[PDB]
C-alpha cells in the first residue's frame, strides 16, 4: 500500500561530489532499506534499518530519515558508485520505490547521427526496416521522430539505448522504422529528426531514393 | 556461508506454467522468511510475495494472487515459486531473497529470467546497414548490422573479428511477437571504407548459427 517515491530517476555527479538521493513515503513509516543494483547483478543490500551498513559497504555511505522522508547519502562520491539504487519499506506490504539511477557527470556532448535504407537481402522478404544510430551523446535525454515525405510516422517504431560508456560516460540509441516492403517503396524521402539539449534545432538525417 | 542458488532461464509460451526454485544454505531454513522480487527489463523492482518456511503461511502481492504460487520443500532447503498461465506481461528476471525480522531483504539470488514466447529457436537474419548513396560527407563513416528475428538470446556481433572494437557499440535486443531484434555500430574514418572491407560476425549459439555479412556501398 505504502508507495514509494524516489526522485531523480537519474541522478549525475562527479568523484569527489557529496550525493544524497531521497525517498518519500506516501505514509509515515519506521524503517528505510537500500539496495545498490548494477547491471547484470542482483540487488545488494546497502543500508538498512535507515542507517546500518551492511558488511562490505564502504564507510562514505550513509542513510538517513523519519516520517515519510528517508535519504542515502555519499560522502564523497566514487566511481564505482555509479548504480541503481532502490528504497524499500515494510509495513502492511513490502513496498520497493521506482529506483534512482546515480550516473558519472560528464560534459553535453551532442549525437552523431546515421540513417540507414532497408538492405538489399531484407527487402527480398517482403520487409523494410530503415535504422538510425544517434551515438555518444550527454546527457541521456533525446526524442527522435521518424518523417516520411516530410510527415511524421509514429507506428512501427522501435528504439534501444545503451548503458553508461565505461570509457566516455555517454550514452548511444538504435531508432527503427519496420514496414513492409510495399509501403516504403511507396515513398520518395526518410527522415530521422533528434532533437538534444546540446541545440535548439532540431537535427535533421535524411536519404532519398531517387 | 549463506547462500541462495537460483535455477536456470526458462523458455515458455504463453499460457503454460513454469516452475522455478531457490536453494537455501548455511542457515536453519526455517529461521527466515523467504521472499520473491520481480524485476522486468530496465525497470523497478516489484514484491510478488513471501513464504514462512516453518508453519508454511505465505503472503501475496494483491496483484500477483491467482499468478504467483509459493511453496517450500523442507527435503531440499529449497523454495519455489510456480508461474501459471503466463503472458508476456510475465517474462522478467525473477530473485528471491531472505527476509530478516519481516523487514529487510538481506540475502539475495542470482535471479531467474523467464521469457514468454511461441517462438521455438530461431536463427537470426542478418542485414547489412550501409549508408545510402552520397551520405557520407565528412570524415567518418557509421556501419552497421541489423540482427532480427531470432529465439532465444544471445547474440554477439563481432566487428572485423574484433579489431575495431573501441567505436563499437552495441544495442540490446527488444522482444516483439516472440522474436528479438538488435542491432550494433561501428565507426571507422570514411578514407578506410569502402576502400577496405568491413564484416560483422553474428554469433547465435542456441541456433549453432555463425554469419559473415561484408558491408557494400
Known amino acids: 500500500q505504502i508507495v514509494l517515491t524516489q526522485s531523480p530517476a537519474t541522478m549525475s555527479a562527479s568523484p569527489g561530489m557529496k550525493v544524497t538521493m531521497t525517498c518519500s513515503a506516501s505514509?509515515?513509516?519506521?524503517?528505510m532499506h537500500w539496495y545498490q543494483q548494477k547491471p547484470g547483478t542482483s540487488p545488494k543490500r546497502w543500508i538498512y534499518?535507515?542507517?546500518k551498513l551492511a558488511s562490505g559497504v564502504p564507510a562514505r555511505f550513509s542513510g538517513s530519515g523519519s516520517g515519510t522522508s528517508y535519504s542515502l547519502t555519499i560522502s564523497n562520491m566514487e566511481s564505482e558508485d555509479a548504480a541503481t539504487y532502490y528504497c524499500?519499506?515494510?509495513?502492511?506490504?513490502?513496498?520497493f520505490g521506482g529506483g534512482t539511477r546515480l550516473e558519472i557527470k560528464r560534459a553535453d556532448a551532442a549525437p552523431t547521427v546515421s540513417i540507414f535504407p532497408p538492405s538489399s537481402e531484407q527487402l527480398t522478404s517482403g520487409g523494410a526496416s530503415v535504422v538510425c544510430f544517434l551515438n555518444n551523446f550527454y546527457p541521456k535525454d533525446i526524442n527522435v521522430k521518424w518523417k516520411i515525405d516530410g510527415s511524421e510516422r509514429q507506428n512501427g517504431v522501435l528504439n534501444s539505448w545503451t548503458d553508461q560508456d565505461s570509457k566516455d560516460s555517454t550514452y548511444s540509441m538504435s531508432s527503427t522504422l519496420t514496414l513492409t516492403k510495399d509501403e516504403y517503396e511507396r515513398h520518395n524521402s526518410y527522415t530521422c529528426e533528434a532533437t538534444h539539449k546540446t541545440s535548439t534545432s532540431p537535427i535533421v538525417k535524411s536519404f532519398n531514393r531517387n | 556461508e549463506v547462500q541462495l542458488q537460483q535455477s536456470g532461464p526458462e523458455l515458455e509460451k504463453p499460457g503454460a506454467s513454469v516452475k522455478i526454485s531457490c536453494k537455501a544454505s548455511?542457515?536453519?531454513?526455517?529461521?527466515?522468511?523467504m521472499n520473491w522480487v520481480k524485476q522486468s527489463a530496465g525497470k523497478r523492482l516489484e514484491w510478488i510475495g513471501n513464504?514462512?518456511?516453518?508453519?508454511?503461511?505465505?503472503s501475496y502481492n494483491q496483484k500477483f494472487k491467482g499468478k504467483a504460487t509459493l511453496t517450500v520443500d523442507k527435503s531440499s532447503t529449497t523454495a519455489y515459486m510456480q508461474l501459471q498461465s503466463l503472458t508476456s506481461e510475465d517474462s522478467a528476471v525473477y530473485y528471491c531473497?531472505?527476509?530478516?525480522?519481516?523487514?529487510?531483504?538481506?540475502?539475495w539470488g542470482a535471479g531467474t529470467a523467464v521469457t514468454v514466447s511461441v517462438a521455438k529457436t530461431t536463427p537470426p537474419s542478418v542485414y547489412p546497414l550501409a549508408p545510402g548513396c552520397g551520405d557520407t560527407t565528412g570524415s567518418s563513416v557509421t556501419l552497421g548490422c541489423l540482427v532480427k528475428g531470432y529465439f532465444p538470446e544471445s547474440v554477439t556481433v563481432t566487428w572485423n573479428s574484433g579489431s575495431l572494437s573501441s567505436s563499437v557499440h552495441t544495442f540490446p535486443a527488444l522482444l516483439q511477437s516472440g522474436l528479438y531484434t538488435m542491432s550494433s555500430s561501428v565507426t571507422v574514418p570514411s578514407s578506410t571504407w569502402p576502400s577496405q572491407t568491413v564484416t560483422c560476425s553474428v554469433a547465435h549459439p542456441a541456433s549453432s548459427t555463425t554469419v559473415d555479412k561484408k558491408l557494400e556501398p
Open positions: 531473497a531472505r527476509g530478516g525480522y519481516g523487514r529487510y531483504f538481506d540475502v
Open positions: 548455511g542457515y536453519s531454513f526455517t529461521g527466515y522468511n
Open positions: 513464504i514462512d518456511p516453518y508453519y508454511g503461511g505465505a
Open positions: 505514509s509515515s513509516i519506521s524503517y
Open positions: 534499518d535507515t542507517s
Open positions: 524499500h519499506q515494510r509495513s502492511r506490504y513490502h513496498t
